[PDB]
Amino acid sequence: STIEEQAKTFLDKFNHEAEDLFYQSSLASWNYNTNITEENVQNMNNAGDKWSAFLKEQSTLAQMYPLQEIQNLTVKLQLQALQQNGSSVLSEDKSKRLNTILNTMSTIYSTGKVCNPDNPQECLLLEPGLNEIMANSLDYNERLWAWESWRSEVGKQLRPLYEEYVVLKNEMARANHYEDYGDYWRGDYEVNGVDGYDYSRGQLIEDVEHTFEEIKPLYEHLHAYVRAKLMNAYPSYISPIGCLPAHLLGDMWGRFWTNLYSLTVPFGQKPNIDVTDAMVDQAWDAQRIFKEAEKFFVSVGLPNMTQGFWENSMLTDPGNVQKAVCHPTAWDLGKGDFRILMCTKVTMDDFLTAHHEMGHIQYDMAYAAQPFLLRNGANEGFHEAVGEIMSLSAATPKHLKSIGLLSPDFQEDNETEINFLLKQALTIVGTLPFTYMLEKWRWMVFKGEIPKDQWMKKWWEMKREIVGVVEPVPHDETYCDPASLFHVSNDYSFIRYYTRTLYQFQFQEALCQAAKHEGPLHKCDISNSTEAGQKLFNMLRLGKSEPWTLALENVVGAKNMNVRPLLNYFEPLFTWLKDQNKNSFVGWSTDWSPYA
Amino acid sequence: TNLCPFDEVFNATTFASVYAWNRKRISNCVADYSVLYNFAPFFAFKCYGVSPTKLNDLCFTNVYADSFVIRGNEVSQIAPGQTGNIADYNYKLPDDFTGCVIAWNSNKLDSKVGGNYNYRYRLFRKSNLKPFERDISTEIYQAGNKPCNGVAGVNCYFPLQSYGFRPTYGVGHQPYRVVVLSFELLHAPATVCGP
Ligand SMILES: *[C@@H]1O[C@H](CO[C@@H]2O[C@@H](C)[C@@H](O)[C@@H](O)[C@@H]2O)[C@@H](O[C@@H]2O[C@H](CO)[C@@H](O)[C@H](O)[C@H]2NC(C)=O)[C@H](O)[C@H]1NC(C)=O
Ligand SMILES: *[C@@H]1O[C@H](CO)[C@@H](O[C@@H]2O[C@H](CO)[C@@H](O)[C@H](O)[C@H]2NC(C)=O)[C@H](O)[C@H]1NC(C)=O
Ligand SMILES: *[C@@H]1O[C@H](CO)[C@@H](O)[C@H](O)[C@H]1NC(C)=O
Ligand SMILES: *[C@@H]1O[C@H](CO)[C@@H](O)[C@H](O)[C@H]1NC(C)=O
Ligand SMILES: *[C@@H]1O[C@H](CO)[C@@H](O)[C@H](O)[C@H]1NC(C)=O
Ligand SMILES: *[C@@H]1O[C@H](CO)[C@@H](O)[C@H](O)[C@H]1NC(C)=O
Ligand SMILES: *[C@@H]1O[C@H](CO)[C@@H](O)[C@H](O)[C@H]1NC(C)=O
Ligand SMILES: [Zn+2]
C-alpha cells in the first residue's frame, strides 16, 4: 500500500465526485446567464457554495500524500493542484480582512462615478461615459479631464487598501513557501522534474526581456509613425522627439491603440474589406454563420460538433421577455456538454467571433479524455492563442471569395494590405510594451525593490522609458494609477496577454508552413489542409498532461517562446514604415514633459 | 406453439444496475428472431462465434439474457478481452464467449432533469471477478494500511457511485440499455429452436 496507490484511488474518487458537482454548478450558472431571475441566482449561489465547500474539504484531505514519494509525473500535477493552500493558511482575522479588502476594491472600481465641475448631477460612470469620451473624442481638454478625474476620485481611494492587500498577499505567499506574490503568480509557467523540458520561475523574466529587446525596433518605428500622424490632429501638444501623452492613445489606459485608425490610416480613399452588405443581401442568419464556420473547421480535419450543441445553445437574443448576458463565451459544462452563448448578429465581426468561439469549443473537445484537473490549456496563454489563429484565417480575402461573400473578379491591391497590417499593428504591437511594463512594475513592487514612497515615481519612470508615454499632470505618492485598471483592482494576472500574443504567431507560421503556403504570412488560409489540422490536434489533445514546452514543440518545433514569426508577419509594414520614416526621428527623449 | 418470450427482456419498464444484473433463462420454447430486429436505432449488434443472419435457426440447450444499462462510452467493454471499470469489477465475458450484444440509446426513458441517481456501479475493488460472477457486497473499501471498522473516513471510501444521468448529457455519457445473450450446449437433447 504505497503512497502512489493511496493517491491514485483518492484521485479517482475526487474526479468521480467533481464531475457531478461541477456539472451542477455549471448548469445553474448557465440557467442564470440565460434566465436572469431571483430563484436562478439563489440556485447558482447554492451550487457554487457546495462546490467551494467540497473543493476546500478535498484540498484539506489531500495534503497527506507528500510529493517526494510519488513518481508518475501525471498524478503529480493533480496533487499539486489539490494541495494549493492559498488563503487557507492564515489566521481567521487575516483572511477576513483580505476578503474585505478585495470586496471593497472591487466595489469601489465597479461603482466609480466622476462628476463634471459645472452642475453637480450629470455624473458619468466608466461604462458607458468615460470610455466613450476616451474613444470617440478629439478634444484635448475633455480627455485630460476624464483621465485625471478617474484617477483622482477612484485611484486615491484604492491606495490605502492596496497597501494592506500587498502586505497580506506577501505574507500569504511567504507562508505558502514562496518568496513573494509575484513568484507565486509566475509559478504557472514553472516546469520541474522532466529532463530537457525544465523551466525555472526566474527564467520567465529573462525570456520576456530577451523577446522585448527584439520587439523594440518595430515598436519604435510604429511609435514614430503614430507620433508623426498625431501631430496633425494636435498641432501644439506633441513634441517631434518626445513621448506620447497618455490621454491621446484612444483608450482610457493606453492598453490598445485601436481607436487611432481614423487618424493614422495609410490610404483613406481605399476602404477595408467589409462583407456585411453581402451577408445581408444573401439572406444570412446566425445558423448559416455557425454552419459556415463549422464547415471551415471540418475542412482541416477537425470533427463536426455534437447534436447537443445545436439544441442546447442559444445563438440569438431571446427578446424583451427574457434577459440574458450578451457576452460571447464558450461553455464546457463537462460530461459531453458544449454550448456557446452569443447574441449573434449579421456582421463580419460576429462572423469572426463565431470562428473564435468554435476554436475554443474544439480545444475543449480535444482534451475531454483527460482527468478533471488536467482539463485546461498548457498554460494561461494557449486558449486565446487558438482563438486568434482560428479567426485569422477567416478574414483572408481568398477565404471570403471561396464562400461567396466577395466577387470573383475582386483584385487585391497592395494598399489594402498595408491598411490591414496597420490595423493589426495598432492592436497587437501597441499592447506588448504596456503589458510588459505593468507586469515588471508589479513584480518589483511585490519583491520589495520599490519602497512604498517611490511607487508613482518608479511607475512613471518606467512608462517614460519602456512604453514611451508621459503623464500629462504630475502625480505624488497619494495616487494609485495602476489600481485604476480592472486587472489590478481585481486580483488578476497580466503577462498572459503578452505570452499569448507571442505564441499565436508562432502557431500561425508553423501551420502555414505545414500547408505548403507560398507568399507573405499575412495572406495565409489553412482551409483544405489536413496537415495543419493534425499538427494542431497533436497539441490540442494534451491539455495539462505535459509541460507547455513539449506542447509548443509539438507544433512549432521550438523549445521556447520566440518573436521572429511575429516580426515576419509585419515585414511589409515594417519596410513601408522604414521608407516613410526617412525624414523623421525614431526614438524618444525621457526628459520632455507636457507640463515642463 | 409456445414462442420464446423475447418480449419482456427488451420491453421492461425498469432495468437493473450494472453491479446487480438480472439473468432470466429462456428454454422449452421455439425461438424467433423478428421481434428483436425491430427498434431500428441500434448502437451495436456485434456477434462472436455466430452470424446474425445465420442466427435464424439453431438448436441449443439454454439461453441467458442479462439486463443492465451503462453510459455511452462503456459498451466497448462488453466485448471479450477488454479491461476497464465495467469489465473488471462489474461484468467479465470469457474469451470464448458465444453470443451477441445489443445496445441502444435510452435517454428519454432513463434520464431526469435534476439527475437520475438510481443507477449505480462499483468503482474500487480488491480484486477482479471470473466470468459470469456477481457481487452485491457493500463493505467499506480500505485504501490504506489500517482497518476502517466499517465507517468512512481517512483512506475509507464507499464503493458504489450513482451515475446521475441527465437529459442534457453527451452521447458518451447518455444512458444505453444493453442486453447480452449466451448460448450453451449440454449433453441433454436440444429442444430450444424454432421451425
Ligand atoms: C476547399 O475545397 C473545396 C473542394 O474543392 C475540391 O477539392 C480540392 C482539394 C481541389 O482539388 C478542388 O479542385 C476540388 O474541386 C472547394 O469547394 C469547391 O470550390 C469551387 C470553387 O472554385 C467550386 O467550383 C466547387 O463547386 C466547390 N466544391 C464543393 C463546394 O463541393 C472550396 O472552395 C475550397 N476552399 C477554399 C479554396 O478556401
Ligand atoms: C497548508 O497548511 C497546512 C496547515 O494549515 C499545512 O499542514 C502543516 O504543515 C506543516 C509544515 O511543516 C507541518 O509541520 C504540519 O504538521 C502540517 N499540519 C498541521 C496540522 O499543521 C500544509 O503543509 C500546508 N500546505 C502546504 C503545501 O504547505
Ligand atoms: C426561464 O426561462 C424559461 C424559458 O426560457 C421559462 O420557464 C421562464 O422564462 C424562466 N423561468 C422563470 C421561473 O422565470
Ligand atoms: C501513471 O498512472 C496511470 C494511471 O493508472 C497509469 O496508466 C500509468 O501507467 C502511470 N505511469 C507510469 C509511467 O506507469
Ligand atoms: C459532418 O456533418 C456533415 C453533415 O451533417 C456530414 O456530411 C459529414 O460527413 C460529417 N462529418 C463527419 C466526420 O462525420
Ligand atoms: C504597390 O504596388 C505598386 C505597383 O508597382 C507600387 O508602385 C507601390 O510602391 C506598391 N506599394 C504601395 C504602398 O503602393
Ligand atoms: C415496448 O414498450 C413500449 C412502451 O409501452 C411499447 O409502446 C412498445 O410497443 C413495446 N415494444 C415491444 C416490441 O414490445
Ligand atoms: Zn477566447
Residue numbers in the entry:
A (entry chain A): 19 to 614
B (entry chain B): 333 to 527
What did the paper state?
The phylogenetic analysis showed that BF.7 could evolve from BA.5 and gained an extra R346T substitution. The R346 site is a mutation hotspot, and previous studies showed that it plays pivotal roles in immune escape and receptor binding. Pseudovirus entry assay indicated that all Omicron sub-variants have enhanced entry capacities compared to PT. Notably, BF.7, XBB and XBB.1.5 have a higher entry efficiency than BA.5 sub-variant, which was previously the dominant strain worldwide. BQ.1 (KD = 19.07 ± 4.08 nM), BQ.1.1 (KD = 14.70 ± 0.37 nM) and BF.7 (KD = 13.37 ± 0.29 nM) S proteins to hACE2 are comparable to that of BA.4/5 (KD = 14.37 ± 0.41 nM). Based on the ACE2/RBD structures of these sub-variants and a comparison with the known complex structures, we found that R346T substitution in the RBD enhanced ACE2 binding upon an interaction with the residue R493, but not Q493, via a mechanism involving long-range conformation changes. From the structures, we found that it is R493 but not Q493 that is regulated by R346T substitution through long-range conformation alterations. The residues participating in H-bonds and salt bridges contacts in the RBD of the five complex structures are all conserved as expected. In all the five cryo-EM complex structures, hACE2 H34 possesses two structural conformations. The H-bonds and salt bridges interaction network in patch 2 of all these five cryo-EM complex structures are extremely similar. Though the side chain of V486 is shorter than that of F486, V486 is also a hydrophobic amino acid that can interact with the hydrophobic amino acids, L79 and M82, in the hACE2 through van der Waals force (VDW).
